[PDB]
Amino acid sequence: PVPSRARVYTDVNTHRPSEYWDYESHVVEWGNQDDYQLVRKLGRGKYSEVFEAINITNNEKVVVKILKPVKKKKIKREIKILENLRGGPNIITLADIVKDPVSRTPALVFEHVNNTDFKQLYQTLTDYDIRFYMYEILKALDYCHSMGIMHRDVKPHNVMIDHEHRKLRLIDWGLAEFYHPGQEYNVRVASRYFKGPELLVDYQMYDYSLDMWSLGCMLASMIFRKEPFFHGHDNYDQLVRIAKVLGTEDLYDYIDKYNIELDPRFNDILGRHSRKRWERFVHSENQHLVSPEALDFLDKLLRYDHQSRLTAREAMEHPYFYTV
Ligand SMILES: NCc1ccc(-c2ccccc2)c(Cl)c1
Numbered sequence: 001p002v003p004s005r006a007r008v009y010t011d012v013n014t015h016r017p018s019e020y021w022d023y024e025s026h027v028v029e030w031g032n033q034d035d036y037q038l039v040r041k042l043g044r045g046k047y048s049e050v051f052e053a054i055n056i057t058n059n060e061k062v063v064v065k066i067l068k069p070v071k072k073k074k075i076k077r078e079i080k081i082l083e084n085l086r087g088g089p090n091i092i093t094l095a096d097i098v099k100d101p102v103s104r105t106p107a108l109v110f111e112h113v114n115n116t117d118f119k120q121l122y123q124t125l126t127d128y129d130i131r132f133y134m135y136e137i138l139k140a141l142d143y144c145h146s147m148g149i150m151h152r153d154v155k156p157h158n159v160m161i162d163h164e165h166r167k168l169r170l171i172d173w174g175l176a177e178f179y180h181p182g183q184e185y186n187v188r189v190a191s192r193y194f195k196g197p198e199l200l201v202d203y204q205m206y207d208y209s210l211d212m213w214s215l216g217c218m219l220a221s222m223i224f225r226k227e228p229f230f231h232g233h234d235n236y237d238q239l240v241r242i243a244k245v246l247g248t249e250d251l252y253d254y255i256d257k258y259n260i261e262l263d264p265r266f267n268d269i270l271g272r273h274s275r276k277r278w279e280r281f282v283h284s285e286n287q288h289l290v291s292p293e294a295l296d297f298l299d300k301l302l303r304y305d306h307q308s309r310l311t312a313r314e315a316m317e318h319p320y321f322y323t324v
């Protein structure tokens with residue numbers, strides 16, 4: 001394959017000492033698990049259990065994410081990234097890191113967010129509310145990309161919103177990684193519906209722009225009330241769903257530009273598809289959320305070529321946000 005490099009924040013890690021990005025060498029220090037009283041279970045993740053808790057020293061609510069220690073290197077990575085990003089705009093705050101002695105289990109302690117339900121959001125949110133929260137996510141992405149970090153798991157479940165206080169936090173940094181120009185990354189990242197074409201075609205030299213594709217998927221589902229927008233049933237079918245909207249001609253131009261070898265599993269499923277106009281997804285139920293500025297902004301995010309997508313900073317300057 002042909003090499004690629006990010007158009008922005010290309011060398012931010014190159015120009016910092018190893019301590020910043022070498023998470024494997026990072027020394028993790030535990031807090032006191034006895035400072036936290038678990039209140040209730042909030043839910044269960046792939047390799048984690050999330051609880052609402054009280055910090056008994058200051059009577060503040062916190063969230064405790066109990067990790068199933070499957071890979072130590074991955075836990076060190078999440079911790080180092082959370083420490084590096086601590087205090088950034090709309091980044092979840094890691095308040096503490098604790099361990100249970102007997103069970104020998106690590107846990108991350110976060111600021112608590114009174115999360116407004118997803119199904120309770122996409123019907124009451126206005127055109128303004130969509131622009132407002134999209135801009136809040138862009139603040140978090142431009143910040144983490146400026147800090148040389150790709151989130152790699154942008155999706156609705158990883159965006160906590162306290163609607164009453166118009167407060168947004170980008171969470172679950174467990175798949176995040178440091179961007180190093182020329183580095184070949186694992187493509188088995190992000191959640192199916194939000195995976196960029198780069199991942200689906202096994203193009204490893206990707207960058208922060210992967211997050212901009214995921215953001216585009218979120219925007220499309222919100223303005224069109226079609227959740228998820230690209231409904232793949234497996235990773236191969238996910239590319240077919242994208243190709244049914246973006247068309248197969250541009251898919252091959254992308255493969256040719258980067259000299260990508262297309263997996264034989266695509267042979268019988270990809271077919272031939274024209275490019276669809278964004279206006280065809282407009283209906284009576286969603287027309288109050290769609291505007292020419294909304295469709296122009298979406299068109300500039302949902303592009304096969306990872307290099308041709310708007311950066312988070314370029315996205316923030318789009319006319320779609322003139323009212324926020
Ligand atoms: N003081 C009550 C209590 C008990 C166990 C844990 C715990 C569980 C798993 C991993 C780390 C800590 C915590 Cl956070 C609090």
Ligand SMILES: NCc1ccc(-c2ccccc2)c(Cl)c1
Pocket residue numbers: 117118121122125129130131133134137155156157158159160161218219222
């Ligand atoms: N935690 C679920 C959820 C629901 C809706 C949105 C949203 C809101 C406005 C614009 C785009 C997405 C987000 Cl960011 C998260």
